[PDB]
C-alpha cells in the first residue's frame, strides 16, 4: 500500500520499501531498471543497486559514522536519495507495468 | 600445498598420541572432533590457506593441547 | 629534584594539618610499593590485582595523557588502543590493589595534557602491549618529545584551536586555515598571563616538602 | 542554607590519638573549619553499643594503658601493609 | 550513558549488525527504572526495521576509577531467549560484567579479549 | 608370539574399523588403493594398531606397509 | 569438597555427553577451569543444573557465596558460573553453532574469529 503512494513514505523509512521494489521487480521479471539506470546487470541487493543509482545521479552526503576510535564525518553516496528516485520512477510508470497482487488474484 | 605433507601427518600423530593421556574429558570426543577438523579443512586448500591451518594446529600442540586438561 | 605533583597542596583555606596527616599516610604506601617518576606523555605499564577474580593480576600499557589530584586521592589517566578500540583507565596511585607501576618509556611532551590525542590519528594513540622498557639516565634531564600530531576532520571533542587550551602539540597549520586561526583568537584573554594576583608560587612549599620527604627516608 | 542539620549513622573508621582526629564515613554538614557536634548515634540498630566504649568518658590521666597513636577498624586497609591481593 | 535515540555500534559478527547499512542502530528503550544506560544494562534497538534486544558493553561517558572508558558506545545483540545473536566478539570487554547482577556469562564466553 | 595370532589379531582389529568398510580385507588388502585410505587414514590404522600390540612402532616405515601381510611381518619381526 | 574432580564425576554420574574441560591460563581473568557438556534434551539440561547446584550447597562452601543459574529463560543453553569454574550445558546443535571449545582451545586462531577483520573510514570520490 506504500508502493503505489497511498501512505507517506517516511512512515516506512523509504529503505524497507525500495528493497521491496527490487524483489518484486526482479520477481515479476520487469528488468527495466537496469536499462533506465544503465546498471551493469540485474541484481537483487539494495546496497548494490542504490550504490549504482547514486553514482549515476551524482548525489552524495556527509554522514557521521561511528568507528572504534570515535565519531567521524565521511562523505558518502546518497543511499536515501537513490531510494526516493528509484521509488519516484516506479510510481511514474517508466519502470514498467506491475500487478503487485499476483497469484492472489488468479486463485 | 602445505609447508610439508610429512609435517602435516606428523602433527596429527603427535596430537592423537597425546589424545590418550587426557583424564578429565571425553577421550572419544577428542578423537572424533580432531578427525573432523583435519578432514574437512585439509582436503582442498592453497599454500597460504594450508599454511595457516597447519600453523594453528601446530600452536595448539605446543600449548598443552589447547589447555584441554 | 622531581617532587611528585600530588604532594604540592592546592591553595585555599584548608588547614596545613590536613595535609601533614595525609603525607604521612602517602609516604607509608610508597615504602611498601615504589611509585616511579613519570610525566605526562610517558608510557607506563601498571599491574593491578583484579577484585572480580581470585587475586589474579591484570596489565594495561598506555601513554599517560593526564595527571590530576592531590593527596592520597591523586590519579593519572593513560590511554591505549586495543584491537582498534581506544580505552582510557584513570588509575589511583595509592589504591592498595596496584601491584606494580613500571615506566616503560620516560619522557616529557610539549603539553601537560594530551586529551587531544582522542582526536588525533589512531597511530599517535596505539602503543605495543609487549614493548620492552627503554633505557634511562638518572643523572640527566628527561627528554622532551617535540612531536606535533596530525588531527582527523575538524569536528573534535573540544575546540583545541581556542586560546584557553593553549595546545602546542597539534599541527594546526594542516587542519585549520589562517582564517579559522584568526577567528579562534577572538576568545583570547591577553591579560590573564600578566596579572600577578593569579599566580600560585610553590617554590618555598616545594623546598620544605622535599626536605621532609628525604628526611623520612 | 545556614541551617542546623544532622547526619545519622556515620561509621568511625579510625581515630588518631596524637592529633585527636576522628575519621567519619561520608559527608558532614558545614564548611571546612566549621565546628560540629559529635555524639553516639541515636538510630535503632545501635541502641546500646556504648557498652564497650568508655562509659563516663576516656580519661588519659588514668593511664591504665597507653593507646596506640592510630586506632583502626578491622576492615580498614592500613597504609604500610602489603598490597591487597584477593587470592 | 545511553538514552533513547542514541546511535550505537554493534560489536558482534552477527549478520544483523555486521552487514553495512547506511543507517546505524538507534536505541528505542532502556531496560531500567533510570532512563540512563550504563555498562551491563540491556536496551532495545531499532536495527534495519527490526526491533532487537541488546546489551551495552562500553560507553564514552566516564565511570568510577579503575574502569575502562571506551571511545565508542559498544553493544551486543541478544536473542529474545537471551542467547547472543553473534558467535564472536573481538573487541575488548570490561571485566565488570562478570559481577554485575544479571546474566552475562554467555556473553563473556563469546568474548576473547577482556580489559 | 604367534604368527597366525598376529595375522588374525591384525585382521581382527582391521575388521573393526568400519571407517575402512572391510568389504575385502584380504591379508594383502592394499590399504591405499583397495581401501582408499588417504595418508591420514592409513596412519590412524597404524596408530590404532599400535595400541593393540603394545605400540613401539615408528611411523618412519609404518606408512609404507599398505597390506596386512607386511604389517604382520613388520610387528612379527619387531616383537 | 567441591572441585573439578568432584564436578566431572558428578557430571559423569548424571550421564552428560561430550564433557570438555579446558584449563584457562592465569593471564586471562575469567576462570581457572572452563567446562562444556552436552545434554540430550531441555528437560535433561534442567535436571543436571539443579543437581549440581543442590550438591554444591551441600558440599561445604559454607563460607563461600551462592551461585545463580543463568539461562533459564533460554531453552537450549544453560550456564552456571562457580567461583573458579564455569559450566555451560547446551544442546548438540547449539554447541555446534557457537563452537565454544574451539575459541578457548585456539585463543586467537579460531576460524570464526579470523573472519572478523578491521577497517577504516575514507571519503568517497
Ligand atoms: Mg562533547
UniProtKB/Swiss-Prot annotation, chain A:
Compartments where found: Mitochondrion inner membrane
Function: Plays a role in the regulation of the mitochondrial ribosome assembly and of translational activity. Displays mitochondrial GTPase activity.
Quaternary structure (record): Associates with the mitochondrial ribosome large subunit; the association occurs in a GTP-dependent manner.
Recorded family membership: Belongs to the TRAFAC class YlqF/YawG GTPase family. MTG1 subfamily.
Name of the molecule in the record: Mitochondrial ribosome-associated GTPase 1
Stretch of the intact protein here: 219 to 325 of 326
From Swiss-Prot, chain C:
Superkingdom of the source species: Eukaryota
Any one GO BP annotation for this protein: mitochondrial translation
Modification Phosphoserine, positions: 4
GO cellular component, one term: mitochondrion
Keywords: Mitochondrion, Phosphoprotein, Ribonucleoprotein, Ribosomal protein, Transit peptide
GO MF assignments: structural constituent of ribosome
Subunit structure: Component of the mitochondrial ribosome large subunit (39S) which comprises a 16S rRNA and about 50 distinct proteins.
Entry's family note: Belongs to the bacterial ribosomal protein bL19 family.
Protein name: Large ribosomal subunit protein bL19m
Organism: Mus musculus
From Swiss-Prot, chain E:
A Gene Ontology biological process term: mitochondrial translation
Subcellular location: Mitochondrion
Keyword annotations: Mitochondrion, Ribonucleoprotein, Ribosomal protein, Transit peptide
A single GO cellular-component term on record: mitochondrial inner membrane
Domain of life the protein comes from: Eukaryota
Record carries keyword Amino-acid biosynthesis: no
One term of GO molecular function: structural constituent of ribosome
Main localisation: mitochondrion
Family to which the UniProt record says this protein belongs: Belongs to the universal ribosomal protein uL14 family.
Protein name: Large ribosomal subunit protein uL14m
Species the sequence originates in: Mus musculus (Mouse)
Gene encoding the protein: Mrpl14
UniProtKB/Swiss-Prot annotation, chain G:
Broad class of where this protein is predominantly found: mitochondrion
Keyword Lyase recorded: no
Swiss-Prot/TrEMBL keywords: Mitochondrion, Ribosome biogenesis
BP terms from Gene Ontology: negative regulation of mitochondrial translation; ribosomal large subunit biogenesis
Subcellular location(s) of the protein: Mitochondrion matrix
Keyword Disulfide bond carried by entry: no
Subunit structure: Associates with the mitochondrial ribosome large subunit (39S) via interaction with MRPL12 and/or MRPL14. The interaction generates steric hindrance that is expected to prevent premature association of the 28S and 39S ribosomal subunits. Identified in a complex composed of MALSU1, MIEF1 upstream open reading frame protein and NDUFAB1; within the trimeric complex, MIEF1 upstream open reading frame protein functions as a bridging scaffold that interacts with MALSU1 on one side, and with NDUFAB1 on the other side. Interacts with MRPL12 and MRPL14.
Protein name, entry field: Mitochondrial assembly of ribosomal large subunit protein 1
Organism: Mus musculus
Amino acid at each position: 500500500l506504500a508502493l503505489c503512494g497511498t501512505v507517506l513514505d517516511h512512515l516506512v523509512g523509504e529503505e524497507t520499501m525500495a528493497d521491496y521494489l527490487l524483489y518484486t521487480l526482479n520477481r515479476h521479471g520487469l528488468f527495466g531498471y537496469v536499462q533506465h539506470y544503465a546498471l551493469a546487470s540485474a541484481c537483487d541487493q539494495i546496497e548494490w543497486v542504490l550504490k549504482n543509482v547514486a553514482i549515476k545521479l551524482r548525489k552524495t552526503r556527509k554522514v557521521k559514522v561511528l568507528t572504534g576510535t570515535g565519531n567521524v564525518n565521511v562523505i558518502q553516496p546518497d543511499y536515501a536519495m537513490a531510494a526516493r528516485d528509484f521509488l519516484r520512477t516506479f510510481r511514474s510508470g517508466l519502470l514498467g507495468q506491475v500487478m503487485l497482487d499476483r497469484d492472489i488474484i488468479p486463485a | 600445498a602445505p609447508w610439508s605433507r610429512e609435517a602435516v601427518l606428523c602433527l596429527y600423530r603427535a596430537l592423537l598420541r597425546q589424545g590418550r593421556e587426557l583424564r578429565y574429558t571425553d577421550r572419544d570426543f577428542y578423537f572424533a572432533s580432531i578427525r573432523r577438523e583435519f578432514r574437512k579443512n585439509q582436503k582442498l586448500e592453497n599454500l597460504e590457506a594450508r599454511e595457516k591451518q597447519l600453523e594453528k594446529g601446530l600452536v595448539f600442540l605446543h600449548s598443552k593441547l589447547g589447555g584441554l586438561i | 629534584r622531581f617532587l611528585s605533583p600530588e604532594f604540592i597542596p592546592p591553595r585555599g583555606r584548608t588547614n596545613p594539618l590536613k595535609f601533614k596527616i595525609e603525607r604521612k599516610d602517602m609516604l607509608d604506601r610508597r615504602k611498601v610499593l615504589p611509585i616511579p617518576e613519570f610525566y605526562v606523555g610517558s608510557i607506563l605499564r601498571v599491574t593491578t590485582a583484579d577484585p572480580y577474580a581470585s587475586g589474579k593480576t591484570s596489565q594495561f600499557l598506555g601513554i599517560c595523557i593526564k595527571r590530576s589530584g592531590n593527596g592520597l586521592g591523586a590519579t593519572f589517566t593513560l590511554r591505549n588502543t586495543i584491537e582498534g578500540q581506544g580505552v582510557e583507565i584513570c588509575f589511583e596511585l595509592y589504591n592498595p590493589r596496584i601491584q606494580e607501576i613500571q615506566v616503560v618509556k620516560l619522557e616529557k611532551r610539549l603539553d601537560d595534557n594530551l586529551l587531544y590525542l582522542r582526536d588525533a590519528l589512531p597511530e599517535y594513540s596505539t602503543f605495543d602491549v609487549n614493548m620492552k622498557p627503554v633505557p634511562q639516565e638518572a643523572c640527566q634531564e628527561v627528554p622532551v618529545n617535540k612531536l606535533k600530531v596530525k588531527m582527523k576532520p575538524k569536528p573534535w571533542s573540544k575546540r583545541w584551536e581556542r586560546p584557553n587550551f593553549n595546545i602546542k602539540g597539534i599541527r594546526f597549520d594542516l587542519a585549520l586555515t589562517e582564517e579559522q586561526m584568526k577567528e579562534a583568537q577572538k576568545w583570547n584573554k591577553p591579560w590573564i598571563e600578566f596579572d600577578m594576583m593569579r599566580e600560585y608560587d610553590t617554590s618555598k612549599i616545594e623546598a620544605a616538602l622535599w626536605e621532609e620527604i628525604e628526611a623520612s627516608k | 542554607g545556614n541551617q542546623n542539620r544532622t547526619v545519622y549513622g556515620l561509621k568511625v573508621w579510625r581515630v588518631n590519638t596524637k592529633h585527636n582526629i576522628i575519621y567519619v564515613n561520608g559527608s558532614v554538614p558545614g564548611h571546612k573549619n566549621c565546628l560540629v557536634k559529635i555524639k553516639d548515634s541515636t538510630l535503632p540498630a545501635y541502641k546500646d553499643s556504648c557498652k564497650n566504649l568508655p562509659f563516663p568518658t576516656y580519661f588519659p590521666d588514668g593511664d591504665e594503658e597507653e593507646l596506640p597513636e592510630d586506632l583502626f577498624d578491622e576492615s580498614v586497609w592500613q597504609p604500610s601493609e602489603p598490597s591487597i591481593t584477593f587470592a | 550513558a545511553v538514552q533513547k535515540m542514541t546511535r550505537v555500534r554493534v560489536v558482534d559478527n552477527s549478520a544483523l549488525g555486521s552487514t553495512p547499512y547506511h543507517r546505524p542502530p538507534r536505541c528505542i528503550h532502556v531496560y531500567n527504572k533510570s532512563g540512563v544506560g550504563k555498562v551491563g544494562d540491556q536496551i532495545l534497538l531499532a536495527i534495519r526495521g527490526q526491533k532487537k534486544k541488546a546489551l551495552i558493553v562500553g560507553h564514552r561517558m566516564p565511570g568510577s576509577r579503575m574502569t575502562p572508558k571506551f571511545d565508542s558506545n559498544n553493544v551486543v545483540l541478544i536473542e529474545d531467549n537471551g542467547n547472543p545473536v553473534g558467535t564472536r566478539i573481538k573487541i575488548p570487554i570490561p571485566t565488570s560484567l562478570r559481577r554485575r547482577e544479571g546474566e552475562y556469562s554467555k556473553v563473556l564466553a563469546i568474548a576473547q579479549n577482556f580489559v | 608370539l604367534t604368527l597366525d595370532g598376529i595375522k588374525d589379531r591384525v585382521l581382527y582389529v582391521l575388521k573393526l574399523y568400519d571407517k575402512i568398510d572391510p568389504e575385502k580385507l584380504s591379508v594383502n588388502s592394499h590399504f591405499m588403493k583397495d581401501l582408499g585410505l588417504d595418508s591420514l587414514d592409513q596412519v590412524e590404522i597404524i596408530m590404532a594398531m599400535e595400541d593393540e600390540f603394545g605400540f613401539e612402532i615408528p611411523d618412519i616405515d609404518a606408512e609404507k606397509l599398505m597390506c596386512p601381510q607386511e604389517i604382520v611381518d613388520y610387528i612379527a619381526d619387531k616383537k | 569438597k567441591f572441585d573439578i574432580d568432584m564436578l566431572v564425576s558428578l557430571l559423569r554420574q548424571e550421564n552428560a555427553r561430550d564433557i570438555c574441560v579446558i584449563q584457562v591460563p592465569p593471564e586471562m581473568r575469567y576462570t581457572d577451569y572452563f567446562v562444556i557438556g552436552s545434554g540430550t534434551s531441555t528437560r535433561h539440561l534442567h535436571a543436571m543444573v539443579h543437581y549440581l547446584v543442590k550438591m554444591y550447597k551441600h558440599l561445604k562452601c559454607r563460607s563461600d557465596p551462592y551461585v545463580k543459574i543463568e539461562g533459564k529463560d533460554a531453552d537450549d543453553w544453560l550456564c552456571v558460573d562457580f567461583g573458579s569454574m564455569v559450566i555451560h550445558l547446551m544442546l548438540p546443535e547449539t554447541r555446534e553453532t557457537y563452537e565454544l571449545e574451539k575459541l578457548w582451545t585456539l585463543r586467537s586462531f579460531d576460524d570464526q574469529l579470523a573472519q572478523i577483520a578491521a577497517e577504516t573510514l575514507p571519503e568517497d570520490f
